[PDB]
């Protein structure tokens, strides 16, 4: 033995993910003739809990009618879901919004409907994202959007104010230059910039305000505005293929799944 | 021409963690050796971290009653923080170290008389007892207790944490945490014992120790 | 960019008087590439180190720092010093750790006399996080973000025995060098003098 | 005829020092493993008894002067009793153990300026400072200090004791003991430093630990 | 970042150099990241990249051109009328673009000098000659209609054909001035 | 460069080969230059080889 101990009652580590592929395909009757040993069993024994279940004479259900597997995460969360929305009001206003994976963060200030349920299904999170935003409203506004990692300084989140950060801090880290008239669309990778390894979904104390958040995107505009028309932005987050999930968690209640 | 030998002057001598370079060296005297005994006054193995870290520590014990209704939180216990305690044997390995990596082996012992009925649940919960469901706690590596089949189960769980290692002197958040909800209520008859016993044993697996400190 | 990093650059300066008790703390070194305390009056310039300019244009830093303590004695100034690195973060009460309590931590001793006068102290990468954020870019303390992987007290391990026709004190330069150095997540920041 | 498997009942499960036989067994759950890291947040070796017991502890330090006449007892220090102390790293290995076998590695560091003259002696003395001669102390494994040749020596000495192992909580007698007699007086000139420094380092070699105790 | 400038009237010709001297305090010279980086080393040889952004009033047909050393060009860091003819401007090399069509310029800066390399920190007449290598000057037209400011801003970037020489002690915390 | 200490003195000197200027570069960063370090403990004569560093 490696540790010099022993084990008598059969009970070990439990709930290893991915038991089965969810698209319906054929791997005749499944049960029937033989008496069902998989109906009655011991759930207190996890080896006896992993027995092939049956209760009735069943046969092959057949195949499915869509090759697109709607039960893998990498093609399920490809549809981009809501994050936040915000409007500008005056000249050179700098807006700042984080990406706070905490379930304590009720919407709008935090995770809304689909992001709050999905990113509180699991404990650990590592990988880059995708963000899709839409320019809506007044045209010919030359703004700038940039990412800021953890540790580095940035302006106050969820607050529209004037920018207190210089342009040499903004040009050195990384941003984009675009007008509302040229292309009107942003589909951006969110870089995984942290000295810590992974981020969590539901923590407490100072670990919640530090180890749940990973990144932040803040926007300052210019040439807004001429003759009075509101400019509205809205953030939709999407997924990429370099992220992996860890420790499947009990999903949230029907109460904290708040929709916007 | 015959040369008389001299003493060495500069050499890298010292431990890997306790290192001091001397400009004037000297040969260390050593007489005798580690003499083996055909008669040992004790019959044990010599002590090591393999036998001191891997030994079950009673970190918690309770007493579940009949008056506890369904899904009542009988015990809310922290795993590693109760392991880091002076009255156990791992304090001699965790006081002189700061950052660690380890695996947690939980064993829970209860005792029903078979005239009682009911059920208990012990779950290994990392992070928080947040808005996740009580009726969804089987996704955790857990244990299910019954008054019908068995009374002792043991649970193996890994290190689940955001950063690289765990800080004892100032932790970010507790790595693991166990809870006891009433999985099925304790029902008895007349004269049957209206209680049952409860024990929580714990030990480390695959222990790593780094970052020695001089302070307490 | 490894040119301005591995070459040892003067980061700090401290003497070693003979009128001090054994075990008295002389100067701690907050172990990071961000550390420098020199300046100049002609010209008026805050003396950066060549390693403190490379890493200050990043968020995170990682690498095995090699401190080089060049003493300037005579051949007859005798005694020993203690360079005890205590890991963790930039802020623990390491001043309360006693000398024999500091013998628990790994360290090294150096005779002031001999045939050499510079000890290259290779600092291990001991941190809870695999990197360490530029918290100097921010302006707030927070448990989880930090600046250094530990501190390094220069102790008085032995007294300075010397005649009167030589000096009563030996000054020690603190060179700043490293090996296997990595930084990422670029930015722009001008570092400020760690005023000890 | 197909047989449904069941759960085990009686088995010898438990540690070698922490052993409890259960009448109702359960399979211990284990998910994940000890995942290796290509990126380690610290660059050290993992901690062990080999790097915690074998590290020099400053157990004593003094300051020898000119006014100490010939064969004056400058320091009378106990070896293992000063090693068994809370402010060192071996307290985490000696608090949870009672009977031990070990070898003693002494290293003594002094520092003369070469305008001073004189000599010191450090001897490893077991048992007593009884009616044995001071001028016969070279029969012990010892060290001789000089203001001419060298200033750091180290001494290796074995376990010298009557019984089998050493009791920390109630010792019969101290195993080893070091003394410092003035081997030659400290003579200086005008303006020369009238003192020298002194340090005593100590560590264990070939450590054995037996007899775990729950109490402090 | 390199610089920023605004136009005010019709056919105003703006002129800005690329002055690698550390004496040139920002804005008139090297700002934050360029002043630290291009004073890390003594000698410099190779072409650059410049990324500018058109911001403000639209439908302005201007022209941007490079001028090497030795040849004549208008006064740097001064918005004025152009005293240079178009045959001098069309022969050397420029671009034609409107603010409405593409609104972006990512341009190579040509290494045009009879001297070999340029320096970062010199004194005397060598500082005003051997530190500078190139200059980009801009004259506009159709600016402006109904009053809206047009703002340009210059951001410099790097290419792969440049090489660095003689690693130098980096600058203090005092001359690293940020904008 | 040739200097001469008696070994009862202590101290240190530095000689650096500096092209261009004594500008806002740091004094505590002058080890990036091909230089020499003088000491009252080890040696008293050093020699430095430096190339031609010039724009034209």
Author numbering:
A (entry chain A): 3 to 29, 40 to 272
B (entry chain B), D (entry chain B): 5 to 220
C (entry chain C): 51 to 246
E (entry chain A): 94 to 272
F (entry chain B): 112 to 167
Paste lines from the article:
analysis of these 5 NAbs is representative of the F6 mAb. (A) The F6 footprints on the HAV surface. interaction between F6 Fab and HAV capsid proteins. Interaction between F6 Fab and HAV capsid proteins. BC loop, EF loop, C terminal of a VP3, and BC loop from another VP2. involved in the interactions with F6 Fab are shown as sticks.
